[model samples]
Target: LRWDLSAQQIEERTRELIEQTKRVYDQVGTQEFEDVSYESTLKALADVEVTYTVQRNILDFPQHVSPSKDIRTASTEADKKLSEFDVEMSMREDVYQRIVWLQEKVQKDSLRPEAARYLERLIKLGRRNGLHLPRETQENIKRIKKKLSLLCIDFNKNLNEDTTFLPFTLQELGGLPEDFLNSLEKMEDGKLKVTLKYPHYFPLLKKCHVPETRRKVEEAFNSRCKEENSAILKELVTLRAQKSRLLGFHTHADYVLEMNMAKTSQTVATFLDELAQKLKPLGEQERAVILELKRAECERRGLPFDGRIRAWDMRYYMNQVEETRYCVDQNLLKEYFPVQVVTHGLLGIYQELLGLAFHHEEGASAWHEDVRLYTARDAASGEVVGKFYLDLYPREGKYGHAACFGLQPGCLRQDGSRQIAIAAMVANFTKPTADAPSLLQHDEVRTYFHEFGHVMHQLCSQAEFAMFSGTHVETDFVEAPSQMLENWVWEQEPLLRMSRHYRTGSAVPRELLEKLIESRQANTGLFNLRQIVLAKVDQALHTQTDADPAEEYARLCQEILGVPATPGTNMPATFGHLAGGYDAQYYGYLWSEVYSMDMFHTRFKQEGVLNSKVGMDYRSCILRPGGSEDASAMLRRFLGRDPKQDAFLLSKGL
Candidate 1:
């Protein structure tokens, strides 16, 4: 909870925590087989895990969010050291043997379901770490794992430190809003500088009228960290392939998917392939529509037009389609979504739906001035449930994307006391300027809802073990709840509740709202196809032993996404998901969306979007259990049947 640690203090604290963890494991390791009990072995192991989780968050999170360069560097070093220690600990034969003994002992006696599940997970972890392999092979796997960890860190660091920008004259950046143009940094040559930050990069792609300018920006954005991170990604893939083969798996995808809901590389490939096939016709139809728009715009502007759409042309044309066809202009629509109004409306909707109250803890300690802390309480019981921090806005050296990071997890302590969970949502929305409050486009609002859904998942968890606490579910199923929550942003009722004009403070007019809703499926085909392309590229890299990732990515984009890749650009270098923990698991987004839409339609849509009864049921059945029960079981309990993909396909207009 302390955010003001000095660089030296961060290192000192990290070392002290590792020492404490090692001492506890040593106690467990030295116990005689006859003396080993749940308390001495299994429970102790879980407690140490809880300690490690908390310490990791405390010591490592600053690398992504801290403003001070010294603190960030120290935290990065702490992360590296902790990861090395974790690899060594995972391969401990003594701990694995004690866990095996406890597993057999517990089979004859009854234990709480959560405890039993925890024991089995520990055993699985040990086996997956190669506890059953020859010692030399295990050692080799350990070495590869540590090297992969460092390489992954380096890949992310290169991305975080990249300050690449493109300078453009105002005339070259035409069609962008005045406020957006005014916000950029000016150079000595009087040209405006646009960095590859999301707040700058996305709006430029969506609104810039100059096709050449858009192409240059897209090329630069995609090519960030290309030289260094591309090499890191290739090495990561090779190391993963070697380690998985050493562990008797055919490919890295097989090794990773063994622990995910998909269960096999073939299953994921089949899933993506089937979805892509279904989407191809729809994508082709959408492409023809957008291409016609491009043709007309070119003729009107006296510019040359190619029959095909390039990589950078998609977003610009999609925006044009929404504005011209549906009259849903994002710049105009953003007038109704000032950041503060959106935040208030969002919190209000979740509060009513979930039957919880959130109280802002004024002046609470946080990493930055922009961060705010809030505590959640059960409305009826008036008991504190959990806490969360919101850090919204972009800064140099900060993580460049939105996500929910668990700072602490809920669990039952040794004395039977409950530990409340804590989580932080880090995001980079446009910051407010002197002339105007920060305004969010509709898509940003949807993203806000999705990320907060993850925060709710972490806060509402009532699990008995830290290992099974919120957002700890199978990787493929972890995003379902958040994706389901995204449906709320597209609903008329929720939209009306959350939107307000910054100047007049008036709610969005019904006509404008209708236009926004009507255009929801405007580019559904191309959007979903792009997701498939990324997932397939991730799968290809992990499943194949040797392939040029950049070339493969361009090939897939042309074949599957129906667009030529930006020439000479290595887009995979900027794909943080591959280098950061997702790896072969990026398909989880689409995999989980199948279940998300099912849950949303069967429960929220059928019952009512804001029905507290359905909301509470969702919290108990889906959120509370965390990873204690299977994701399939959670879905059936909440939906009253197995999940179906009909809702997902229908939503996509497939």
Candidate 2:
């Protein structure tokens, strides 16, 4: 929102900014840290970075949401240029010296904890980028990182730019609801249009009766960004491995995991292996249950039984199993809560629990009309706290998943004024139709809660430095704050508080609500097993130097997941996490969940989900400190004990 962007303006502005940043880096590079001092050196570094941070926030909205191709391309280039600048800066021995000098000055523990932590991270970042290597070796690693950055950009672009669609005849949509059918746009040939977008693909997989249609669409989905991305994945792996060797680590995972809570590739691999061993047997039991139902249905149709379940068949049968066994139909259950009702109800719950209130701002600037804006204020003081935007519906070229993007970090400025934070939550919920409102599926409700948890994490942040802004904690612990909020969606009292039937204006009946919760719990084995599979595959790919990614994906799916790959499927091509800063760290999702569930059970359990005191305590101990304290330290401070996995296991019914 700073300036209107065009291709030419984008080029000029990016070049100007890059030149400016280089000048600043050059000045800092030659100066002695002894002359500048710790506070001044860090202050200058943080101040110079404000330009890139602002531009990064400004660029993503257009890159992720704009329908104009030129804008997206320009922003993409801008982002790549800025990332390259970051890499170049990280390699400078001068900047690393600043940190080393600060460390020596503060030796024997004289610096404040946050200052000490910040100095430590700066040195780690420097070393990770090859500061410890010979100058020639550092240059080699730099070139490799620049290339890797561009390749990652391209890999993501291939997925985002893809517009593949499928044509399905009306007969193929037998199990889907009439409302869903009515919302479709038909081709001139009378076939309905379905795309690889999750809102479309998931509904088809879960609701469409035509097995062949489901298989075709799933194949299309699994094959996204195919041939182009396959080679990129291979080369990326090679480059990362080469860089890790240069950095004195055995593999990329080993290099990256040093800072996370897990601390090493060995630890992560052991964690994944142990969990996989536990889940695989339970998964097999769950598969046996699904296969029995599948064979029975095949027999009912007088068709041959294949004696196997392909990846595409999982969601469809999972739905069937839920309905047939627990009498909980997600579609029918959706009617109890409309999108707008759930949105406000969720905000109300946060208000009660967190001692914060929200004021909706009409006609705020946003990339889309569907976007809504709100300002968070402290309930007690009526003081402004933060702001967030909700882009709740899907559109062309939008990001496919639900996530909260931190646009502005909350930081105390040099003059002592606190900067207000801004965050945006993007999602692809079922859009409201002409005759009916958007009714959220149960999982969508959980997703909404999960995403807002991130929003609150951002809004509630009171970081002393921009470098330690909200959601900037250890990558392994970042998800815990968000995952912890998912506890509310499972509780019956909150469910009723969050819902009202679209037409009848009544909360979901208690008996039916119990069935929904029970059904969701019914297949915990399969549910958790699937998570373990993805985590294992991610680590498997990153923990080694050489393997054909396609072959590796298939082998891991069969070996660990107990599900054979669909024919010709290259899952790594569409695995966004691999290129999106998650590569070896996907296991963090499960790892963090253990801490989150433990926090919920140990503290929040007694006070209840809506307890104001519990909410403030969490905000103070977790959200407010941000990355100023290590996540482990923060959790120990809050929980009054070392975090445990027992709550997580019990929650999963393991």
Candidate 3:
């Protein structure tokens, strides 16, 4: 059993794993295969299932964070190799039970029920079909799992190597706050370098004194998607359609929706379609917003006149609304919310709201000098359960964007100890600018909170099954908890408790909070419609055979949304979330928002935003429960009923 290794033994084990699941793929369809040869093949495949699963999981865990050369790493190469192991799992026909009935005929429905529970399940199979899945059905499930798992990584890799940079001269950076310019990195020439990180990108375009530089930078940023990898987008579109056909479904949307709580593509379509009508009036209100604002600014300065507003005009215009309405400038708030204070306030909120505490645990990081590790435990009992690592600030060849990683799943170990969960959050932001702190745009602040919600769930939940842990709910329901938490950032109750001024130790002014709430809804209709278009394009592509996928993806974006997608842009190739976490289920945010709104609204409807009872209630059922209970059931247990869509839809000024 224990293959303790010398050179010869290690090589033998290596060869065994390399060929474990070879020559297995989807040749078996339901209504055929009554032969002994088919049954023998199935028997041989089933015998080594455990060995294959262990070897694949073992080899993969280290490869995920391994070093990279050009663009790819040993981890990614390992993914492609392990993908082969999954193909073998797909080919087996579950002959253990299939041959049982074929070889001996007094047809036993008893074993048939067990087989269904294992593979092609129905109600007659088990009390709950999710409880026990059959072997042959499981193989098909494995391939679908593999396909979805590798998609997110591919998306990130493509975008990481993308060559897009914005260069601006020192003189052109006028009107920009001194803090931002000081933080900007000078490039090969005398020009300053600015990429897509919100800390640097947003300020240069929105606050730059020179209009020409803003226009130049914005154009360069958008142009990065000009057919950068349309072939991959086209390839994935064809593969999804083929996968749907393999499952005997008419379209990928149909196959994908089968697993969602919505039950069908029709119901989901109706949800998004109907909501669009309610949001249209707001969309109309904001149509001429940019032109009017730009016209006023030019007239004020007595400069050259312009009628139509270009894409670059949007940032300055949005700031106009923010400044005029509440006198809230992000540049001012940055003085109060230093990066370290913001992080400390966040941890304080968690401690006060949930009976959890954080303390750094050294030697628990994978890479990066800025990375730090912290352990979370019950404040009262002092029982440690989970941990997280943070990699803040941007460096070359580090993950090129802001995101979170669930490094380990929460589960109960066989030895009776609670298995600790590990998570990492990466941020691409300004390092401390000389004397001033790393300033975050309101948008980046929201993103930070969003990823923190994922980390909290990963590192806090006490669960038994890895398959059903925190943040592991249905596809559409995934974002609700994180999105809901973001609502608190703009609220003063948490600020009163946590947000302290860096130098003065004073509170953030009420007018700033008011501005945040007011502008939160401005242009929101436009953004929501854009997401709807993306979700539609992703869901619709799985139905076609070889349709012009690049054109079709953009067509759906243009048709479903009024804004024309820029020509020759293959944004889909860089859409990493669509390949993994959001594939065929990008709309989970909207769906999950329904429950989040209902839960937060009902519990804190009258109590203040910092209500302890409501916060504790949330931590008890939703935040810490994981997948031990069905996600809907978990929400209902706290709310005492199913979620109603009234609050979510009406939040758009209905």
Candidate 4:
């Protein structure tokens, strides 16, 4: 990497290099219908960018992995700056120049082999540096790139293939709905079946009658993540902390938070506390309600009531309370939730509020067979706004997680019109069953809405620059759209339309909706507080320059969350988040909740979910805007003031 160049050096050197590269590819070997002149110009520009990115990434890698703020190699930023002079702004910037030329020629009806070669070379450098590989490969580099990319796909596939589960008798599975029991007949002769999936564990643990069974699932859940995640977790965490020190930061959290909304550990802590205070009272109330119900139910059964509610009991009994109050049974509700019907319902919700139309595209190769593609269009102008790929279900050899993947990052196309934003959503929910068609649980349905929020955000955005597109804003605030939509899951009117009894063709009974709604917010306070504890603990582990990860993780959970750590469940060992994009800031889950509550409960509350004015304002203010503007500045512009802790806490009945 070269040293940083002065302004004059940048101008003179850029001119000199551009002239030279222009001579190399411009004078000869013109292909049909390909404009060598424009290709030369674009190649010149992309080269500078390529050189800059490569050096920066290489340099950044080491700095992000330091142990005690002492790096073993060059820093990421320092390397980037060096590359800018040597590779970027300087004459050596052919990487950027070639890319512009390739974007034109690679996908052409008559493609140039050199275009493939150059793109392959550029992608190879990137793969070595650690960008996602499958997308990086080009025509010429396809063979080599494919092999390396397989490592990534296989690594993740194996991670899922290795997962374990739990089994308990029907007598052991307490607090589960009667309908749910009927659903799991295969496990009746054996132990009540349990997988690592949260959808399965949640209701069972929350409602299981036998204390032993409840504890077993709880232990099993923690143990599962702990077992598979430990080695990589430890390696990744240490490497991350080490990388920070090399870059002149104290720790990974310090490095990450520097670019995030929190700014530092202190700010994150303060913000988390502000949220906890608002929600703690609500959590207590929920807990009290759960206790009272347990007492009443136990008395009816002539059993004891004054026992500590196990983790498993949380979902079961709250659901019981909800069922008692609302009489909603999701099993019966599934009849109306055919995958295709729910799909239209969600689009219809957006259609009325946002003025966007959804169209299906056939014959495209999807990541999975069930994955489908849709083109989002503007209702008023009849313009194609964006595109999305939806991959739903758990399958062998797939990424066993649910998150949005940018199929093609949104960018400002050369044409005056916007390039359609493209993305995909992968989820393991809505698993198929023999007796009934595939169905999603209430929470899973909410997840569907949440994920769709991301796609809509991507497709419906108004940002001019692709970098600013969709959820690419500051990490902490990305959850605002999805989280905001989650509140709709509890709305009686929306639920009535969105849900129906699959077999009977009837909307879910209002009473069941009421119980589900009641239970929905019942333990929200406690659950919300626990999230804060987790974020705080995550931050502490990444930020602390001196501490043992295992001990620190245990203490933080116990002291702040009042939860016990099980042996072999070294949470940090399996926390792959830090290695991926979330890095040291896993707290975004909790951090964004306040803003979500603020927008939903305040701005959009009066007019209800279909309020077009508020929705349009929000689209203009946030969703469509992308990363073109600073996040906090953008948020303050929308809210008219900085967000406060009041709304989130109030939701939990605090």
Q: Best candidate per lDDT, number?
A: 1
Q: What value of lDDT does candidate 4 attain over all alpha carbons?
A: 0.61
Candidate 4 lDDT over residue span 436-538, tens digit each: 6776677777888888888877776655443345676778888887898888777876776676555667777676676777766644566666677667767
TM-score of each: 0.86, 0.84, 0.69, 0.66
Q: RMSD in Å for candidate 1, one decimal?
A: 3.9
Predicted candidate 1 versus true structure: per-residue lDDT over 422-472, tens digit per residue: 999988988888996899988889989999999999989888898899899
Q: Give candidate 2's whole-model lDDT.
A: 0.82
Model 2 pairs in collision:
none
Model 2 TM-score relative to the real fold: 0.84
- Give RMSD to native, each candidate: 3.9, 4.3, 8.0, 13.6
Tens digits of per-residue lDDT, candidate 3, 524-615, equal 76667767766666655554566564576567655544545445445565556556645667766667776677766676554656667777
Best by TM-score: 1
Error in Å for residue 365 of model 1 = 5.3
Please identify model 1 stretches exceeding 4 Å from their true place.
Answer: 1-9, 61-77, 146-238, 361-373, 391-402, 426-438, 502-505, 545-555, 566-576
Mark the 10 consecutive residues where model 2 has the least summed lDDT. 1-10
lDDT string for model 2 (1-654, tens) is 442677677768878887887887777667775576655676667766655666667764567766677887888888888777776777778767766776676656877777677777888888777786788888888799889999999999999899999988878877788888777778899998888888788999998867788889999999998899988888888898888888888888888899898889888887777777766667888889899988987788675778998787788888887778888777879998799889888999888878899999997777677888899999989899999988888888888889898888887766758888888898888788999689999899999999999999998888867888888989999999888889889889889888999998987988888888787566677777777777777876777766777787777778877777787889888888989998889889889987899989988887777788898999999899888888888999989987877787777666
Stronger candidate by lDDT (2 vs 3)? 2
lDDT of each: 0.90, 0.82, 0.62, 0.61
Is 1 or 4 the stronger prediction by TM-score? 1
CA shift of 302, model 4, Å: 8.7
